[PDB]
Swiss-Prot record:
Ubiquitinated. Deubiquitinated by USP4; leading to stabilization and expression at the cell surface. Belongs to the G-protein coupled receptor 1 family. Disulfide bonds join 74-162, 77-149, 80-169, 345-348. The chain holds residues 2 to 308 of 412 of the full protein. It comes from Homo sapiens. One of its GO terms (biological process) is regulation of mitochondrial membrane potential. Adenosine binds at residues 172, 339, 363-364. This is Adenosine receptor A2a. Receptor for adenosine. The activity of this receptor is mediated by G proteins which activate adenylyl cyclase. GO terms for cellular component: asymmetric synapse; axolemma; dendrite; glutamatergic synapse; intermediate filament; membrane; neuronal cell body; plasma membrane. It is found in: Cell membrane. Glycans are attached at residue 157. Keywords: Cell membrane, Disulfide bond, G-protein coupled receptor, Glycoprotein, Membrane, Receptor, Transducer, Transmembrane, Transmembrane helix, Ubl conjugation.
Length: 394
């Protein structure tokens, strides 16, 4: 018999509405930017748009649902369940989109030549539709019978004065905690998050290995070259030539590219120097191999810098997207962890109400943050945001 509940409720409702406004506005901007700019119309950003659509729905539907269910109003139990569980559909859809983005970037760095033929917009669209259907089936599974509708709180249902077939609509009274912990958290949230962690680990390892190979081929080119100018035997020169030749066509594997001309001059100049070396013409081999360094300084170095900056851009982009996964875990793990304490420690007092609603608010603010990550970390998004804001506002 303490403070009137409407005072704490007013703070919670006001905060939730403030979050809904920001989740809608920022994510509308993301969709608008992708619609407007053809540089943003790729497969990766179709999952970004699906993720933005889920976050718009958090503000338009899930947050009004959250406000409604906090009152504990009388409702038919299956109507209560849909109000209580709809946010899990949107959260599961976010998981699928984040997982698809990770696999997309993994395919792009592991087999870039085959990427465009394997990962197409038509297949992406079908993957998205399937993930939304599965998200409804996973998120609304309690409506299929795994619920507490058969064991109502009669004390609460008579206090509130509910009618026949009605319950006081409270989350922890209608949704069983073993579904929430075992099915939703462990299987549907925690396992995909660990998979995303593993995929991103593989992305960074593949990039580090591909940059290391590039550097080893480059040093192999210049080491064997320095050995050429120092040798005094015909076969000693031919040995540094054959090892320079393998590294040559090795780096070649890493019609609108004038780069094959650079590698054909290089490999042809090596073979010329090889034929001299086999004929004992040492000094001719050493002089014919000395013109390699201008072919290197006019073609090979230009292509090994361009391949390096492309890999660095893929690493920077993959880090930007991994931040999105980290902030998702940050905002949703407290609620899951609180549920674990409620479920696994019956000797523990229940987490207090103010902490419950702080964790609910925290999970909702995740629907606000992604547009900020795009604006700060991805230039093409930031510049498109700027144009939209300047033009279609001021
Ligand atoms: C905006 C578009 C998607 C329509 C939104 C549908 C929402 C508002 C509708 C669809 C199903 C509806 C629920 C279905 C049944 C019940 C049980 C009843 O005892 C109280 C109302 C309640 C809880 C309804 C509340 C409103 C509801 C959730
Ligand atoms: C993911 C990051 C933010 C870590 C989150 C840590 C939070 C969720 C943890 C840290 C300390 C935890 C609390 C410590 C002890 C209790 C008392 C118990 O009777 C109910 C659970 C409760 C209230 C825990 C709830 C969850 C809790 C608040
Ligand atoms: C980063 C990933 C692994 C997060 C998962 C950590 C979870 C599963 C761990 C972290 C802290 C753990 C809790 C810490 C203490 C207790 C009290 C005990 O009487 C029941 C189990 C319970 C409630 C644990 C359940 C499992 C738990 C919630
Ligand atoms: C769509 C936009 C908003 C959705 C609002 C959610 C609608 C919330 C349902 C309101 C309700 O059930 O009231 C009847 C009570 O008197 C029962 O006791
Ligand atoms: C943003 C910082 C805090 C948000 C505050 C969120 C939690 C504030 C307390 C909410 C609360 O206690 O809710 C009572 C419940 O609605 C029954 O009246
Ligand atoms: C509930 C809200 C759903 C809102 C869904 C909004 C869907 C917008 C999709 C979109 O913007 O698509 C751009 C497209 O890729 C360009 O060809
Ligand atoms: C409201 C919940 C259902 C929202 C359903 C929205 C479908 C997802 C979507 O809009 O996808 C667009 C696609 O990514 C464009 O290429
Ligand atoms: C626009 C929706 C703003 C939030 C609506 C909250 C609401 O409708 O609450 C009804 C309450 O449960 C009745 O007992
Ligand atoms: C893929 C998923 C298909 C989902 C199949 C959905 C099966 C029907 C669900 C249903 O009919 O639920 C009624 C509810 O249990 C009334 O008490
Ligand atoms: C992977 C991360 C966590 C897995 C380990 C989480 C397992 C937590 C088990 C807690 C437990 O078993 O609690 C026993 C208690 O006696 C029941 O009331
Ligand atoms: C993340 C880790 C959260 C776990 C943080 C450490 C949790 C300490 C264990 C605990 O919460 O003990 C409660 C005590 O029994 C009173 O009921
Ligand atoms: N445990 C829980 N409770 C609520 N709302 C009810 C908070 C509450 C708890 C006890 C009480 O007596 C009155 C109200 N929403 C909740 N959402 C979630 C959730 C969604 C996704 C993961 O956890 N868990 N969750
Ligand atoms: C903007 C947020 C303003 C914060 C100012 C006061 C918040 C404190 C009110 C929280 C009351 C908790 C009620 C409860 O325990 O159920
Ligand atoms: C929240 C951050 C986004 C605010 C910018 C307003 C965008 C206007 C709009 O397109 O709806
Ligand atoms: C729409 C604007 C928000 C209206 C305020 C909702 C009040 C919540 C309630 O009725 O308990
Ligand atoms: C436990 C999960 C750790 C959360 C990662 C947050 C780091 C970040 O904000 O990028
Ligand atoms: C936001 C901040 C929430 C702080 C509320 C914690 C104090 C609860 C008041 C009380 O002791 O009953
Ligand atoms: Na989301």
């Amino acid at each position: 018999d303490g403070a009137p509940p409407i005072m704490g409720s007013s703070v919670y409702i006001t905060v939730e509405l403030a979050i809904a406004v920001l989740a809608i506005l920022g994510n509308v901007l993301v969709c608008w930017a992708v619609w407007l700019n053809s540089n943003l119309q790729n497969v990766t950003n179709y999952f970004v748009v699906s993720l933005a659509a889920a976050d718009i729905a958090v503000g338009v539907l899930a947050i009004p649902f959250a406000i409604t269910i906090s009152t504990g109003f009388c409702a038919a139990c299956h109507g209560c369940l849909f109000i209580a569980c709809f946010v899990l559909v949107l959260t599961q859809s976010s998981i699928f989109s984040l997982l698809a983005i990770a696999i997309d970037r993994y395919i792009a760095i592991r087999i870039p030549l085959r990427y465009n033929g394997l990962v197409t917009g038509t297949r992406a669209k079908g993957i998205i539709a399937i993930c939304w259907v599965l998200s409804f089936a996973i998120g609304l599974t309690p409506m299929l019978g795994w619920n507490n509708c058969g064991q109502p709180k009669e004390g609460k249902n008579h206090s509130q004065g509910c009618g026949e077939g009605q319950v006081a609509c409270l989350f922890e009274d209608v949704v069983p905690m073993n579904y929430m912990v075992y099915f939703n958290f462990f299987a549907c949230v925690l396992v995909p998050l660990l998979l995303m962690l593993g995929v991103y680990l593989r992305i960074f390892l593949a990039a580090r290995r591909q940059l290391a190979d590039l550097e080893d081929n480059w040093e192999t080119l210049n080491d064997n070259l320095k050995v050429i100018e120092k040798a005094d035997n015909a076969a000693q020169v031919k040995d540094a030539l054959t090892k320079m030749r393998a590294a040559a066509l090795d780096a070649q594997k890493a019609e609108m590219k004038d780069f094959r001309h650079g590698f054909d001059i290089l490999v042809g100049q090596i073979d010329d120097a090889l034929k001299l070396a086999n004929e004992g013409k040492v000094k001719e081999a050493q002089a014919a191999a000395e013109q390699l360094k201008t072919t290197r300084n006019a073609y090979i170095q230009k292509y090994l810098e361009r391949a390096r900056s492309t890999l660095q851009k893929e690493v920077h982009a993959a880090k930007s997207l991994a931040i999105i996964v980290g902030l998702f875990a940050l905002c949703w793990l407290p609620l899951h962890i609180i549920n674990c304490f409620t479920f696994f420690c019956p000797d523990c007092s229940h987490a207090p109400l103010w902490l419950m609603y702080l964790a609910i608010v925290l999970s909702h603010t995740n629907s606000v943050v992604n547009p900020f990550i795009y604006a700060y970390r991805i230039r093409e998004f930031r510049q498109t945001f700027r144009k939209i804001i300047r033009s279609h506002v001021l």
